[PDB]
Structure formats: C-alpha cells, structure tokens
Amino acid sequence: DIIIATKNGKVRGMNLTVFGGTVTAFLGIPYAQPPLGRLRFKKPQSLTKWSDIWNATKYANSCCQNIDQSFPGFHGSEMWNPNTDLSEDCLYLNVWIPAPKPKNATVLIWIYGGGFQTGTSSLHVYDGKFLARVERVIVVSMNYRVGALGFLALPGNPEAPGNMGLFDQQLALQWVQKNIAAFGGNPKSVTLFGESAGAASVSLHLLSPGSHSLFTRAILQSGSFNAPWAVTSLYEARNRTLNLAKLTGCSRENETEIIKCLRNKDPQEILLNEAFVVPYGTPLSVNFGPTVDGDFLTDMPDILLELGQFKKTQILVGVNKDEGTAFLVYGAPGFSKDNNSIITRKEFQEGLKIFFPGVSEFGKESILFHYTDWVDDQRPENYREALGDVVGDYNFICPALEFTKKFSEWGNNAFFYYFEHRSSKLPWPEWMGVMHGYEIEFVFGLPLERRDNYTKAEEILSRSIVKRWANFAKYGNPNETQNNSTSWPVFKSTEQKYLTLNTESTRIMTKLRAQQCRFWTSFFPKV
Amino acid sequence: IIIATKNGKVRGMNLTVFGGTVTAFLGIPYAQPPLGRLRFKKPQSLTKWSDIWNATKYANSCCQNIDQSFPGFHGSEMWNPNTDLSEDCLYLNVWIPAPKPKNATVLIWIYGGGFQTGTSSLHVYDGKFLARVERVIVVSMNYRVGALGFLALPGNPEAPGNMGLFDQQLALQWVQKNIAAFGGNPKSVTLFGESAGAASVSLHLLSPGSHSLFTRAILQSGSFNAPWAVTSLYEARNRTLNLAKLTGCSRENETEIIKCLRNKDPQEILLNEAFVVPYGTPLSVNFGPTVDGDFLTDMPDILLELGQFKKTQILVGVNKDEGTAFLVYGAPGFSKDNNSIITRKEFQEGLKIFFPGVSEFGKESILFHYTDWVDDQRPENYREALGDVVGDYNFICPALEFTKKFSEWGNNAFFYYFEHRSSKLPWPEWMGVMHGYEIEFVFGLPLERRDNYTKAEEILSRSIVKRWANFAKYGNPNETQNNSTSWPVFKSTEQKYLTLNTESTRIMTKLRAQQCRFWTSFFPKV
Ligand SMILES: *[C@@H]1O[C@H](CO[C@H]2O[C@@H](C)[C@@H](O)[C@@H](O)[C@@H]2O)[C@@H](O[C@@H]2O[C@H](CO)[C@@H](O)[C@H](O)[C@H]2NC(C)=O)[C@H](O)[C@H]1NC(C)=O
Ligand SMILES: *[C@@H]1O[C@H](CO[C@H]2O[C@@H](C)[C@@H](O)[C@@H](O)[C@@H]2O)[C@@H](O[C@@H]2O[C@H](CO)[C@@H](O)[C@H](O)[C@H]2NC(C)=O)[C@H](O)[C@H]1NC(C)=O
Ligand SMILES: *[C@@H]1O[C@H](CO)[C@@H](O[C@@H]2O[C@H](CO)[C@@H](O)[C@H](O)[C@H]2NC(C)=O)[C@H](O)[C@H]1NC(C)=O
Ligand SMILES: *[C@@H]1O[C@H](CO)[C@@H](O[C@@H]2O[C@H](CO)[C@@H](O)[C@H](O)[C@H]2NC(C)=O)[C@H](O)[C@H]1NC(C)=O
Ligand SMILES: *[C@@H]1O[C@H](CO)[C@@H](O[C@@H]2O[C@H](CO)[C@@H](O)[C@H](O)[C@H]2NC(C)=O)[C@H](O)[C@H]1NC(C)=O
Ligand SMILES: *[C@@H]1O[C@H](CO[C@H]2O[C@@H](C)[C@@H](O)[C@@H](O)[C@@H]2O)[C@@H](O)[C@H](O)[C@H]1NC(C)=O
Ligand SMILES: Cc1ccc2c(c1)sc(-c1ccc(N(C)C)cc1)[n+]2C
Ligand SMILES: Cc1ccc2c(c1)sc(-c1ccc(N(C)C)cc1)[n+]2C
Ligand SMILES: Cc1ccc2c(c1)sc(-c1ccc(N(C)C)cc1)[n+]2C
Ligand SMILES: Cc1ccc2c(c1)sc(-c1ccc(N(C)C)cc1)[n+]2C
Ligand SMILES: *[C@@H]1O[C@H](CO)[C@@H](O)[C@H](O)[C@H]1NC(C)=O
Ligand SMILES: *[C@@H]1O[C@H](CO)[C@@H](O)[C@H](O)[C@H]1NC(C)=O
Ligand SMILES: *[C@@H]1O[C@H](CO)[C@@H](O)[C@H](O)[C@H]1NC(C)=O
Ligand SMILES: *[C@@H]1O[C@H](CO)[C@@H](O)[C@H](O)[C@H]1NC(C)=O
Ligand SMILES: *[C@@H]1O[C@H](CO)[C@@H](O)[C@H](O)[C@H]1NC(C)=O
Ligand SMILES: *[C@@H]1O[C@H](CO)[C@@H](O)[C@H](O)[C@H]1NC(C)=O
Ligand SMILES: *[C@@H]1O[C@H](CO)[C@@H](O)[C@H](O)[C@H]1NC(C)=O
Ligand SMILES: [Cl-]
Ligand SMILES: [Cl-]
User: Fold this and answer.
1) Is B211 part of the annotated catalytic residue set?
2) DSSP states of B406-431 as a string?
3) Of A11, B10, B122, B136, which is least surrounded by CB within 10 A?
4) Could you give phi then psi for residue B366, rounded to 5 degrees?
5) Cα distance between residue B319 and residue B417, in whole Å
C-alpha cells in the first residue's frame, strides 16, 4: 500500500509505470478549506484535518470557469479546457514522486496560466509523471481560483480583498513547506515555474513579502507582471466589481452588502457577466486578475521592481517565437485557423483597432510604420506575420526581456531563452507557427514517450529542455552536461545574451528583437 | 581676342593656366539692367551696342545680404560677393580653351546661396581650370536673388515671381544664340549647379521654356522637392505683403504696393527680408521659386509624377554631412570654435528651431528615430544626429527621392556620395564633409599644385573633373583611367550609387534607406 502522513492526516496514492520505472502520484490533495458560500471571495482559509485516509487517486475538480467553445471537436482549442468537472470546491494540489522514495528531492511547483480567467492543473500537458521519472524531482501542481471568484477586488475589505487566487497559490506553497519533506522533498530546494498567467503569478511571488520564504527559485515561461495584461490598477479593479454588481442586480451602498448578494448568485451567472465588466475589450483582456491589494502587493509592481524591493534569487525566463498568433483567430478580421489568413493593409489596421482600442490614430500609424519595413515587399503574408509580431512583441516578448533586464540589474543571475521549434503534432495551421503555450509539452517531457508519434529530434530537444529545467531547479544554473553542451550564459543588461531552443542547433545570440522592443518600451508609452 | 556676338563685339583676356592658355570673357551683359521701372520684372532682352564691350573683369554681383556672422573667418567670408553689389548685375562669363575648339560641349554653372545670395565671380567657381584640362567651354551667369529676384505677387506681370529663374533662362537663351561664335556646341549643353543652383537646375527640367536650351543636368546637393526649394502661393503672398508692411508700402491695390517698393532704397528691401516669415529657420528661404503659371506651369511634385519634364540623363549627388553647416547659425550648444557636444535636451532645443511648426509628438518621433545608437558610450551622439537630421530631411532624402522618380521614366540616373573632407577647409573637424565643399573639387582647384592641397586631393579632383566633363560630352561619367569603377545607373529597386573619397571609390545600394523612409513615409503625417 502507498500511504504517507500529512500534518492534515493520512493520504494514499497510486503507482504509475513510466519508461520502465514507477512514479507515485497523489492527485487532488486538498490544501485549503472549500471556499464555499460564506468564504467565497475571501482569502483561502487553512485546513484542519480529515477523517481516515484520503485517496489521492483522481484529479480533483477544476475551479469555476468559462470554457473555450469557439471550435468544437478541435484538439487545439479543446486541450486547454478543464478535463474535470467544475466547482467552487476546488482548492486541491497534486504531487508526483520518483520511486524509489527520494530522501531530499528538489521540488518543482507548476502554476498554470489561462489569462487568470481559465486553467486547471489536471491537463495532460501538465502531467508531472515524466519529470519525476527522468530527473528524480518532486513535482507539485495546484488549482487556484480564477476569474471573479478568484480576483474580485474591493481592497480594504476582507470579504473580497482581491488577489485571492494568488493567495490560493501561496497557501499551497505553505503546504509544500509544511509537508513535502514527509514525501521525501527538500522544502529549501523549491522552484516555481509557470506559463503565461502562471509565469505572471510566479513573477509576483518574487515581489510579495508573504512568498519570500516559500520558494527558492523561479522560472517564467512567456509571462511577467509588467506585461500590459497582467496587473490592473487599484480603482479600475473596483470600477470592475461595482459594474459586476449592477450587471447582476446587487449594487448596494456599503461594500459588504454588495458581497452579500454576490454570495447568493449561482456561480454560472457570475461567470457569464465577467465579460461585460469592461467597455472595450481585446482578445487579450483580463477582466478579473491581479491588482494592488495592499496585502499581496504593497505597491504598483513596476515600481517595486525599479527599487529592487524583491526576492534576490536566480530566474529562468523565456518566450516563444510566435506568441501573438494564437490570439488573432479570436477576433482579428481575415484570420481563421482554416485559411492561410493572408490579410491586406486595411485588415491590418482593423487588427490594431481590435488589440489597441483606446490608442490614437497617430499611435496606430506609428506601430504600422515600425513593422512595415519589409525585407521583401512582394510577399503576401507580410501583413499577416506583422500583426502576429505586434501582438506578441507588445504583450509577451518585450515585457519579458524588459523584466529580465531590470531584474538582472540587482545582482542575481538570469537566463533567457527563445523557444523556436514548432511541434510536429501542433493541431493549428502552420501560419501560426511556434505558438503561445506550445513549449509546455516539451518542458514536461511528453516527447520522451516513444508511443506518442513525436519525432526523434523532438525527443532529443525535450530530453534537453527537461535536463536544463531540472538542473536550474537543483543548482540555479540551467546546464545540461559539463561536456558536449552549448553553454547557457547569463542575461545582463549590456550584452543581453539569450539561448535559442530548437532541433537544428542551439546557439548564443544577443539583443532579442531589440529594434522592436525599443519601440514598445521607449516610444509607445509617450503615445 | 575678340568675338562677334549677335548683340555686338566683346574683348577677352588671355589666361595662362597649367602652362597652357585659356581665353576668358568676364562680365558680358545678357539682359537689360533691371532698374527703376524694370525692378521685379522678368529680364528684358537687350539691344545691340555699336561700341566694343569690355569683358575684362568680373561684373557686379546682384544685390544681396552678406554673411558677417564671423568677421575675418575665411570659412564664412569665402561665400560673400567679391565684386561690388548693384541692381545692374545681369552678366555672364565664358571660358574657352586655347587653341579655340569649334564644337566643344558647354557646361553652365548656376550658383547656390539659398536663392538669397551668391555670385558667379567667386574663386571656387573659376571655370578656367575646367576649360584647360578637359577642353570644354564653361559659362556662369549672375541671376537676381532675394526679393529682387523672387518676390511674388501671383498673377501680376509687374512682380510675377521666379524672376531670377527667368534670369537663368535668358542666360541659357543667350548661350544658344552665341556659343557657336565661341566654338561651342549649342546642342550639347549641360547644366550643373549646387544647392539653390541644383534646385534651379531641377526646375529647368520642368519648365517648357527651357526644354529647348540644354541637354543634360548635374544636380549637386539640391532638388526642387527639397522642403526649402519651392514656397507655396499663400506663403509667397503673405511674405510679399509682410515686406510691404515692413518697408512702409502696405497699400490699396497691388500695383500701388509695387510702385512704392520700386522707390525703396535697395538696402531697405534686403534688410527687411529677414522679418518676412515669422517662423524662420537657418535653412529658411524667405523669397524663392514659386508656382507662377509661367516658368512653372503648376506644382512641381505633380509635374514630376505626371511625367512632364525633359527626358535626359542626369547626375545627382550629396555630401556626407550636409546639415552641419547650418547648426552654427542658431542651434543651441553649437559653435565654430567648440567641439559642440550637446545634451539630449539641447538636441530637443535644436529640433524646435529647425522644425518650428511641427507638433510635440512629431519632434518626439524624430528624436526616437535617430536615437538608436550603435554605441551609447559616445558623447558625440546627439551632435552627430541633429546634423544628420538636418542633412537627410533638407538635402539627402530629397535628392534620392528625386532621383528615384526621375529614373523611373526610363532615364539614366547617376548618384554619388561625396565623402572627402578638404584638408584646407577652415571649419572645425566635427562638421565633417560640409555642404558646398565639393565645388572646388568639381572645378578642379586642387589641380594647381601650389595651392596647398594634398596630391590625393589632386587625384580625387582630376577624376571628378573627368567624369563631370565626360557626362557632359557623352551622357555617362566614365573615366578612362584603366582600372576604375564603372559608374552604373540609378534604378528604382537596386538604387546603386558611387562613393567619392581619396581612399577608394566603391559602389553601394540604397543610400540612408532606413533614415529616408522616415522622411518620405511617416513624417508627412505628423
Ligand atoms: C480509499 O481506499 C479504499 C479503496 O480501496 C482500497 O483499499 C485499500 C485497503 C487498498 O487495498 C487499496 O489498494 C484499494 O484501492 C477504501 O477502503 C475502505 O475500507 C476497506 C479497506 O479494504 C474496503 O474494503 C472498503 O470497500 C472501503 N470502504 C468502506 C469500508 O466503506 C477507502 O474507504 C477509500 N477512501 C474513501 C474516503 O473512500
Ligand atoms: C502671415 O503673416 C502674418 C503677419 O506677419 C507678421 O509677422 C511678423 C513676424 C512681421 O513679419 C510682421 O511684419 C508681419 O505683419 C502672420 O500672423 C502672425 O502669426 C503669429 C503666429 O505665428 C502671431 O503670433 C502674430 O500675432 C500674427 N500677426 C499678425 C499681424 O497677424 C501669419 O502667421 C503669417 N502666416 C500665415 C497666415 O500663414
Ligand atoms: C535537505 O537539504 C537541505 C538543504 O538543501 C538541508 O537543510 C539545511 O542544509 C543547509 C546546509 O547547506 C543549512 O541551511 C542547514 O544546515 C540545514 N537545515 C537545517 C539543519 O535545519 C536538510 O538537512 C536536508 N534534509 C535531509 C533529510 O537530508
Ligand atoms: C551543473 O553545474 C553545476 C555547477 O557547479 C554543478 O553543480 C555541482 O553538482 C554536484 C552534484 O553533481 C554538487 O555536489 C556540487 O556541490 C555542485 N557544485 C556547485 C558549485 O553548485 C552540476 O553538477 C552540473 N550538472 C550537471 C548535470 O553536470
Ligand atoms: C490702384 O490703387 C490706386 C489707389 O488710389 C488707384 O490709383 C488711382 O489711379 C487713378 C487713375 O490712374 C487716379 O484717379 C488717381 O491718381 C489714383 N488714386 C489716387 C488716390 O491718386 C488705381 O486706380 C488702382 N488700380 C486699380 C484699382 O486697378
Ligand atoms: C554530442 O556529441 C556528438 C558527438 O560526440 C562528440 O564527441 C566528442 C568527443 C567529439 O569528438 C565530437 O566529435 C562530438 O561533439 C554530436 O554529434 C552531438 O551533436 C552532440 N549532442 C548534443 C546534444 O550536444
Ligand atoms: C470567454 C473566454 C473563454 C476562455 C478564455 C477567455 C475568454 S480568455 C482566455 C485568455 C487566455 C490568455 C490570456 N492572456 C495570456 C492575456 C487572456 C485570456 N481563455 C482561456
Ligand atoms: C472566447 C475567447 C476569446 C478570446 C480567447 C479565448 C476564448 S482563448 C484565448 C486563448 C486562451 C488560451 C490559450 N492557450 C493557453 C494556449 C490560447 C488562446 N483567447 C485570446
Ligand atoms: C542673413 C543671411 C545672410 C546670408 C544667407 C542667409 C541669411 S541664408 C543663406 C542660405 C543659404 C542656403 C540655404 N539653403 C540652400 C537651405 C538657405 C539660406 N545665406 C547665404
Ligand atoms: C545670419 C545668418 C543666418 C543663417 C544663415 C547664415 C547667416 S548663412 C547660412 C549659410 C549660408 C551659406 C552657406 N553656404 C553657401 C555653404 C552656408 C550657410 N545660413 C543658414
Ligand atoms: C508501488 O511501488 C513499487 C513499484 O515497483 C513496489 O515496490 C510497490 O510494492 C508498489 N505497490 C503496489 C503496487 O501496491
Ligand atoms: C478566412 O476565413 C474567414 C471565415 O471563413 C473569411 O471571412 C476570410 O475571407 C478568409 N480569408 C481568405 C483570405 O479567404
Ligand atoms: C576696352 O579695353 C581697352 C584696352 O586697351 C581700353 O583701351 C578701352 O578703354 C576699353 N573699352 C572702353 C569702352 O573703355
Ligand atoms: C557641332 O556639334 C553638333 C554635335 O551634336 C553637330 O550637330 C554640329 O554639326 C557641330 N558642328 C558645327 C555646328 O559646326
Ligand atoms: C559652445 O559655444 C557656445 C557659445 O560660444 C556655448 O553656448 C556652449 O556652452 C559651448 N559648448 C561647449 C564649449 O561645449
Ligand atoms: C600655402 O601656405 C602658406 C602658409 O601656411 C601660405 O602663405 C600660402 O599662400 C598658401 N597657399 C595659398 C594660400 O594658396
Ligand atoms: C565613355 O563613353 C563614350 C561613349 O559612350 C566614349 O566615347 C568614351 O570613349 C568612353 N570612355 C572611355 C573609353 O574611357
Ligand atoms: Cl540529482
Ligand atoms: Cl563628424
């Protein structure tokens, strides 16, 4: 039998046979009291104890969401929808462990993305089963509340203070600090890593004083808090929740009364008016997300970073080649996953229309000018590949690079990567290229499974990425081997050296999209 | 040494040049003196004189203001007129090889000076060298500048505008009725000018009245599509009415405005030209070419795109640091005697001066486009950038943009990039290769070896002299010096140009492409 005593009681797991070895999994362990009606919107409250032996043999419920319905049956959009049944009773975590039991293993904890409006820890692509076998690490992933249930903000009010989903993540980190040693883990060798909103969440735990002693290092895949979508100001967050109050018919006059209504509305009706809280939305809009709550975040995050008020620690940051493409099929005119989606100049301007609603026409025009210096002026996809770069450069790449630059200026080693390989099984058309969120499959080592129809070169690349991610976790250095391996240098604001990741050849280069990033950091703000 | 023109006889003088001799005729009147009743009018054709005319010395320069910002300084004073100033100035010069040729091609020089100054008699325009070594006849005119040459009361024949341009055209008419008596070919005639002269040359390609009077054109650091070259009708009229108010001639109708101006002392007109436009810059042309419906039948950009111009091969070019010559005249932090390093804010102040009417975002847009340093450590960054901002916008990008459209219509276009700084140039080193300091090289001044030039400058000058002359004769500045670069032809896609310096002569593509795309595709929307 497979049992282990937690500070909250005993829990039993299951054996899995992987690559000829065995990995022990504990799926759906509760870490906080169910945030049911009274506690809804409150911070997660700590567990007491449970009866008998919890069987952690099945993924738990996903926290409440809307689902991607745009293309039914399509694996590309379906793979990101929650694969468990959805509920407010949803604060659970998973633990994968190498067998035989490790004495003092390093722990990796995954924080899923999804724009702070979706996500779950039970997707196939987040299966930690492999990482535990290949590199003998302990992998933990947790469900955190998302959407209005997770980040409704009336700061100063304990009934709905904002940043609850972040406080869900934080208490899960506290649980690992309290328990993972029983599992054979090292609570002082703990590395956070997430993608998109998960990477943004990871970046903010570096700022929050409460998380400064719950983890050792951080990995940020295609996300950082200084992205335009990550953090919303204090009073637009409140303007958002006052609007949701009316939309649901319970604008009352003193705040705790308005939460009293929202606690009695079924989770659905809250979920289907989350989208009307903003007057002018883009495909990349975060209606209810992180905010400056005065508890998790004591100031606007860009300031905290500029003043060095953060955890001093190694970080591994990176991005994909075509991060913007995934969002154009979700509103940009002329774009479809079933075309090759070659647009014309006016369709391009109508695209900026969508992604930059409140920007002046002089500002749109300057964005166009900076991305229209065609090296070859006869190729149609010029305007198609331009807007995908605009969306990706402004929302992911240039903030991630700018965050690393500012972070490295305070004396801690930073390593930047540029993921350039398109998966052989990518169900989207290839005009979308190396898409957002499609490096995760290689991070978790899915191409190591031989029965999955991945190429041999994709297994080699996945085997490499996995070794470097785990080596960064254990040692703070993303090496692969001492010999026969391209050395990954540190990112420092002068040379700005990054490492490319693909199947042809990994090599060192400098100043990633520096001519494009200069526009977004030094000219677009003044517009 | 006398020659019978169709208006009379003129006497010349023998010049001993490089051991040989060249015969010079300095100061032959090609038009009636534009005085009294004739001020502000198009040049009147001249009647014959029964005596013999003495063309033995340079004639008087046209009335103009004089650069006295740096008294004593050879660098600013070498452009001032070297003869007396007078409204009686419509004269030309002719240099001719000895032994006299009988159908040499002829090169006509149109001087620059912002349409405000200039004269044919300056040492850097001495045509005697060109006639000696390349055996070509060289002609230079004096055309009215300032308000006396370009004041425009549009539609009114008493002050129609572009009078100085008609001055040039009447000189061009003269060479065609008289250069055969000098040994010249009236049907193999090349116009070359610099700055306002090159601008003037480009507008002769558009004027139908001048289609009959030359063959090819060479345009040094100037074109009509340059921002300073042509002033709009509304601008020209406001400018004319402002000069009337300043000189006490604000009156009832236009013909009374003009009679009052005809009675003003010449200096009462030139000393008020500076106040005629409120937002003047260093490069400001107070009175210049306009669309008069006579010399220019409408707006030049139009006529160019529509294809109504003389179809012929041209030679266009610029110098590496065109804009540096103007930062000395008003840009804060600059000086002839400093090293002239400026702050970012001093740079932003300089932008305000050269771009007075542009919005704050527009200046901010210029600042960003020229702040992509290759090395940020260098303190010279902001001083070099504004010099390039002024150079690109005012000269380089217009010249390239002019050459592209012209070559499009199936004409042989040749573009050069002059990169050599004269070892004699009296301005400081930081100004680099300045506006106008390729002229002495084109006129072959380094060819006389007692003038303190480097012999590298002699080789450089003699080659420029040869290609300029061969472009005039043949329509391709080939230079027969064994192994030497084949000057190819400018074309819209590859856009190949020829470098000029003592070290070597290379061949390149798309000059200042990243910079010029800003000035042609984005800045007209700020
Ligand atoms: C979690 O575990 C068992 C389910 O079945 C497990 O039984 C273990 C003894 C072990 O062999 C494991 O491999 C196997 O999957 C539930 O056990 C209860 O108690 C006895 C123990 O053998 C079972 O026979 C009963 O069927 C079962 N239910 C009872 C007694 O009501 C255990 O309850 C389950 N936990 C929960 C919360 O359901
Ligand atoms: C057309 O001219 C007017 C007046 O021009 C005046 O400018 C002085 C510098 C001087 O030459 C004087 O003799 C002449 O009368 C211009 O109007 C001026 O515009 C500025 C704004 O740039 C105002 O601050 C002035 O008060 C105003 N003055 C007058 C008398 O109107 C005008 O700008 C100019 N250009 C146009 C109309 O396009
Ligand atoms: C697991 O490893 C950790 C460190 O990775 C051990 O804890 C500490 O080790 C470092 C020494 O480098 C120091 O901070 C302390 O000496 C240790 N902490 C203590 C003693 O509280 C930890 O001992 C290891 N655990 C096991 C079971 O091997
Ligand atoms: C990656 O590089 C680090 C650099 O030191 C290596 O770290 C050492 O790892 C051994 C375990 O093999 C430890 O006992 C040492 O204490 C570590 N040294 C330091 C300075 O941290 C690491 O081994 C390398 N990884 C691989 C796979 O070669
Ligand atoms: C121009 O304006 C003046 C303003 O007076 C007019 O000049 C008059 O001319 C007529 C006939 O030549 C005479 O009666 C007077 O000698 C002039 N006026 C005065 C006050 O002496 C002239 O007619 C105007 N021209 C026009 C309107 O075309
Ligand atoms: C790993 O090396 C492969 C070849 O083996 C190495 O052996 C060294 C001793 C030396 O002789 C070299 O010939 C080789 O580098 C090479 O073909 C692979 O590409 C390398 N693979 C990785 C992932 O680095
Ligand atoms: C209605 C609906 C359903 C699903 C859904 C959304 C909206 S929005 C979203 C999303 C994902 C990522 C991001 N960023 C990376 C900023 C923003 C939003 N999902 C997954
Ligand atoms: C209804 C709606 C509107 C927008 C929208 C979505 C759904 S979904 C989406 C998106 C969300 C997640 C992901 N990954 C995590 C790969 C990629 C794209 N956008 C931008
Ligand atoms: C007061 C004064 C005196 C002389 C003088 C000026 C002003 S301005 C000038 C001038 C020369 C060239 C140009 N461009 C070709 C742009 C514009 C102006 N000169 C020769
Ligand atoms: C008082 C004043 C103001 C402006 C100004 C001058 C004098 S002079 C000048 C200038 C004139 C001619 C030349 N060349 C012939 C090369 C170069 C620069 N600007 C632009
Ligand atoms: C699970 O772990 C290993 C798998 O090899 C084994 O020693 C142990 O007995 C297994 N327990 C089971 C299958 O109940
Ligand atoms: C792409 O598909 C959409 C929807 O079917 C359509 O509106 C658009 O015209 C298509 N693009 C092209 C180039 O056909
Ligand atoms: C022409 O020059 C001759 C040179 O001998 C001189 O005598 C004569 O005065 C000049 N012509 C006139 C009209 O003075
Ligand atoms: C002068 O030159 C032209 C060459 O283009 C020629 O037509 C003419 O016959 C030549 N000879 C003369 C005018 O005596
Ligand atoms: C350049 O000279 C000007 C005036 O002489 C002055 O304003 C400026 O400070 C000087 N800059 C130097 C000396 O660096
Ligand atoms: C050459 O140099 C000396 C002084 O340095 C000068 O006297 C001589 O006239 C110069 N040549 C000229 C000015 O043509
Ligand atoms: C230049 O071209 C003309 C005709 O195209 C020719 O007469 C001359 O010989 C050429 N230059 C040489 C051979 O250097
Ligand atoms: Cl290990
Ligand atoms: Cl320089």
Assistant:
1) no
2) HHHTT--EEEEEE-PPPTT--S-GGG
3) B122
4) -70, -45
5) 6
Q: Please tell me the distance from the alpha carbon of residue B168 to that of residue B149, in angstroms, as a whole number.
A: 11
Q: Which residues of A467-479 are buried (b: 16+ CB within 10 A; e: fewer)?
A: bbbbbbbbebebe
At what resolution in Å was this solved? 2.8
Residues with Cβ within 8 Å of B101's Cβ and at least 6 positions away in sequence, in order, are: B135, B137, B183, B184
**Phi, psi angle pair for A109, to nearest 5°:** -125, 120
Q: What single-letter amino acid sits at B455?
A: K
* CA–CA distance, A185 with A98 (Å, rounded to integer): 10
d(CA A295, CA A517): 32
Q: Helices B233-246 and B254-262, interaxial angle, to 10°?
A: 50
Range of A84's domain? 1-527
Residue of the CA atom closest to atom 23 of ligand 5: B253
Report how far apart, in Å, the C-alpha atoms of A460 and of each of A341, A451, A456, A485, A502 are.
Answer: 32, 15, 6, 13, 10
Residues composing chain A: 527
Contacts of A367 (CB under 8 A, 6+ apart): A352, A356, A359, A390, A519, A524
CA of B259, nearest ligand number: 5
How far apart CA B197 and CA B168 sit, in angstroms, is: 10
Give the Å distance between the CA of A211 and the centre of ligand 3.
20
- Euclidean distance between CA atoms B192 and B471, whole angstroms: 11
Distance CA B144, CA B162 (A): 9
- How far, in Å, are A13, B394, B437 from residue B228 at the CA level? 82, 7, 20
- Inter-chain CB proximity B361 and A523 less than 8 Å: no
Domain tally, chain A: 1
CA B395 – CA B512 distance, rounded (Å): 12
Q: Locate tokens 């200026």: which residue?
A: A409
Tokens of A145: 């509340």
For A341-376, give the DSSP string: ----HHHHHHHHHHH-TTS-HHHHHHHHHHT---SS
- Is the Cβ–Cβ distance between B431 and B321 less than 8 Å? yes
Phi, psi (deg, nearest 5) at residue A44: -65, 135
Q: Give the pair of three-digit tokens for residue A138.
A: 């302990």
Which residues pair with residue B507 across a beta bridge? B498
Place of tokens 């468990």: A84
SS3 label, residue A191? strand
Beta-carbon count within 10 A of A503 CB: 16
* Cα separation, A439 vs A446, whole angstroms: 11
Q: Which of A62, A68, A77 gets mutated to test ligand 7 (max ligand atoms within 8 A of its CB)?
A: A68
- φ, ψ of residue A95 in degrees (nearest 5): -140, 115
> Measuring CA to CA, which residue among A505, A473, A506 is closest to residue A489?
A506
Q: From the CA of A517, how many Å to the nearest CA of chain B?
A: 12
Side-chain-side CA neighbours of A416 within 13 Å: the count stands at 28
The answer for A105, left when phi > 0, alpha when psi is -120 to 50, beta otherwise, is beta
Residue B306 φ/ψ region, left for φ over 0, alpha for ψ in the -120 to 50 degree band, beta for the rest: alpha
| Out of B364, B372, B522, closest to residue A369 by CB | B522
The Cα B292–Cα B161 span in angstroms is 6
Compute the distance between CA of residue A312 and CA of residue A315 in angstroms, rounded to an integer.
Answer: 10
Identify the residue whose tokens are 């604001």: A493
Which residue reads 């090296």 in tokens? Answer: A375
Phi, psi of A80 (to 5 degrees): -95, -5
The CATH number of whichever domain residue B102 belongs to comes to: 3.40.50.1820
Beta B216-220 vs B184-194: how paired, if at all?
parallel
Give residues with Cβ within 8 angstroms of A99, minimum separation 6: A15, A21, A22, A23, A24
